[PDB]
């Protein structure tokens, strides 16, 4: 029965009020708690499906079945009459003072998932502490609250990709009858950086206002967990303190990697420096083939620069290789020099940085290919998106047993639960689960719901749709072609593929039959769609809806019976019939396939 | 069981071939037919639910169980031996090209649905004649083959839509570090006309090539049906001739109506004369509140010319009124006059059309509101968009019984079947079926499959999503708020609403909280999503993705389970929690809901 739910609720949370809609006394005590400015995790028993076992559990634990029953921090206050009596002597504010632990919940790391979990816990009754600190970049750049995705990540990346799309739109406007010259239009990088930084500062201020509104104690200081309840604090003023708390959330997030080569740390930069540096990188070298490196090089090239991507092994490792190759070809066509199959060796400085003149320095790069030829070049800026490593060592010494591989930090089971019962890890921390922003937010929210509200729903991690914001976006949800062939077998996987030219590219005279599209359908499950991909403009908007459709298993016949929206670039999804098994070329020019 | 499929196939389809995969003789006869360039509508017996029933029906009709069996007009030629002997004697072409009717299929109306049906029937082993003709009742520009959607309706609409969005993009490029002024930049409307007409001509050439490939004969002749198996046609040179056919497909479509008053025909223009108009309309009056009228007015306004919409009763009749008002306000905020609750009385001329230098002549408009106020203004052009009506009287003889309402339309049953057994109506004339291009295309393709290949699946006209390409696009799927309230009552309908802001509008300092999202769900069936609505940039892609999601039974909990794509607009649908019953303001700025 609901014995497990009652045990989970009573052993956690701050205040939980069991009530029903029919009983007027329950509504009265709810109103009394509301007018006292007391946040509570009320539960409606009548509307809950298991309306019988809850009464038995209440009789077993509270020794009384008369709802409403309000419970605080391991202490049973009593019925509505008891709460009214406590408020009569003005002790209701006094009795809501948490417990032996200083905080109901402490989040280490003010990232998107961390802040979402903090807000979710705060609006469910508990008093929450949030601890966010950013170790300064070796160059010296620093950002405020918001985490990686917000401060230096999702938002600035999309803003600069939109700038690149505007750059292409300037080219297309001449073919669209607008009196303007591409030779007479130039990009002011500094103004763009100032604007995006102003927007991100506004976002940080809004986040601070929101967190202080939910009665959440935020301290900008490094946190280091000592025991499953105790954590030490290193303030920016080196004022080390110590706070205890029953519930701990680990949201240390992630920090960009460096290659252990001479001169990389003191001369190179990462995404942390890229999104806030004043000058313009110009002739730029990018190290690493992760999707972040590719999109960064993409919108640096689209903004007048001439970037050289230096791929080590393969473009977009972990993604589908066919559309990875297509994306690389598109970058090559628009002025991106791909130094594939090469490995960096060392870097040096030739001309010192010119921060007084706001000009980038000059850096010499030495590397070697797979055959060891001495690759030599000079660049005005070198960016190291070689990967990302988490610094869980300096936040957890030996308290929790967390297995970690290369690029991994912890081992975690379902319900984001680690080995320690009262320690929870969300966001990028969990290994073997996607490192995305919405998944982190959902994990935090659902963790707060399960802890301080008694919820039973568990956050999903499968079929997580992603989109990379290259000059032309790539959005995928599900499985790749190679992954499907490896898992379900070559003969059990059917791929529906096509090439389409968006209606926005006709008069503009852009490239035709480049925007690719593919499906992954398995015959054993009635042509069930497994991996759905799109490559072209606004790929994320197209991909999100079809990810939603895939979530509960949309079949190929479902796509066939669905009717398109005219005119849109996504139409060809509901008109997919070409098969790779037949080998028919998907080059659709003029008349649609 | 399969008797009905067999009888409809033999009595309707042209060339049929019952065969299996395991039998090698069937593959041999397939190869023989392929070498003879005689395409066939083959059916794989071993790839169907009940092969034994098909074999029993064949024994009841073909008298022999041994597959394969090839049929022409349903006649039993025989087995593979008979077909091989006939091919050796070299008279199979005459056998397959002889019948009591001149053509197997006659399709009147060369629209997207018409060409789709023609190609689907042709590649399914049949001979078909597609007849299209356009009668320019106004001064007119007789566009070639391509139908309403391609020649006039859809493609030019989205082309000038992207022109308007490029106008907005140049306006907003100031904040993205682009060195221009938006004052020295002007517009070239003639460039619009020439480019869009060039693209239309390329599409027409592609369509002609496609119809030539599918061996379909196309004659630009007026269609006028006579008897259930014969039609008399009028060539371009007034050469009246007579053609008989086995089956008839009606795709007459519709043409814009006219508010018949003196001068409304010889002076004003409609959408037919809008997408090829040599001169820029400039200060324009728009008549009617249909989505075409608002789309055209927004196009001209964002292009630069001030426009005055003149709404009779309500904006966007048939859509949700809330977003209708929102979209109207969005045009109003960008310089679109709105003479709401007004109807026209007369139009006259002051200056003749100045065609020597391509300048529009001046016109005077007189009308009255609901209170009789004498509205009196001057416009050098008036565009009449008061809906479209079909000319069945010019295509269909009165001897056959059909139904027409005030707006026209043709009565028809579920399987696109008219009163006559071999006369079929698809496109914009079906009784109660949506007036959309994919509707016509799917209806034509599925009808051809059900006719000349014995298909079973029917085209779906339910939950047909749409998108109107106003300057702020509006895309909806399912139902509306008022429709849901009428259907199930207030207590059974729950609305989730959100006011969001695209990331592309942050630096640009565009409108905030203007964008909108609405979700209509029914409580009695597990919060099943009925009507979903989006109002923002690139709404068509989101709307189609979510229409595909909804069509196969998507609930709100399914939306919650989905992990969003960050950063885009569409993932805001996965964070829908505000309810209209609670009355919380949709406006979220920093917390973003
Ligand atoms: C350039 C770039 C682009 C990206 N684009 C996308 C994208 O489009 N979509 C997407 O889904 N994801 C994207 N990501 C990933 C995204 O940054 C993460 O997935 C997301 O931030 C994870 O959420 P979080 O709550 O862990 O936030 P995080 O930012 O990962 O949380 C880390 C925070 O905790 C703080 N912290 C760390 N250790 C401590 C400690 N001991 N004490 C106190 N505070 C501490 C850090 O200072 C930081 O503020 C991108 C990342 C980068 C670098
Ligand atoms: C301004 C405008 C915008 C539109 N935008 C959209 C949109 O965004 N999305 C969408 O889905 N739909 C849109 N439509 C609708 C779309 O144009 C039509 O619904 C589409 O053409 C339907 O296909 P059809 O079979 O009716 O072809 P149609 O082209 O409508 O009809 C076939 C053609 O045959 C002609 N014809 C008539 N009688 C005869 C005869 N006796 N012999 C020969 N030919 C004849 C007709 O005039 C017509 O041109 C729009 C329409 C207009 C006017
Ligand atoms: C669906 C989509 C589509 C795009 C490709 C991969 C997925 N998203 C990218 C991605 C997500 N993880 C996540 O970290 C590792 C795991 O923790 C997690 O399972 C995984 O989702 C990656 C890791 C390396 C490399 C790329 C990724 C594809 C085609 C299957
Ligand atoms: C989903 C969407 C959303 C937008 C509204 C209607 C649907 N599509 C618009 C529409 C489709 N028909 C079609 O022609 C008439 C009928 O033939 C057909 O049934 C109808 O779908 C219209 C007619 C007049 C006016 C608008 C329309 C709404 C809110 C339910």
Author numbering:
A (entry chain A), B (entry chain B): 6 to 598
Please, what does the article write about this entry?
TGR is a 130 kDa obligate homodimer as the functional stereochemistry of the FAD redox site in each subunit is generated by protein dimerization.
To increase aqueous solubility of the compounds to facilitate structural studies, the cycloheptyl substituent in TGR uncompetitive inhibitor 8 was replaced with a sugar moiety, resulting in compound 9, a noncompetitive inhibitor and thus capable of binding the enzyme in absence of NADPH. First, the TGR-9 complex was subjected to negative staining TEM to assess quality of TGR particles and then, upon sample vitrification, to a cryo-EM operating at 200 kV. After structural refinement of the X-ray structure of TGR into the cryo-EM map obtained at 3.6 Å resolution (as estimated by the gold-standard Fourier shell correlation at 0.143 Supplementary Fig. 25 and Fig. 4a), additional electron density ascribable to the compound is present in the doorstop pocket. Upon placement of the compound into the cryo-EM map and structural refinement we find that 9 adopts two conformations in both subunits, spanning the three subpockets A, B and C. The two conformations differ in the position of the polar sugar moiety and in the orientation of the indole that is 180° rotated with respect to each other. The cryo-EM data show inhibitor 9 bound in the doorstop pocket, indicating that the design strategy, based on the initial fragments found in X-ray co-crystal structures, is successful.
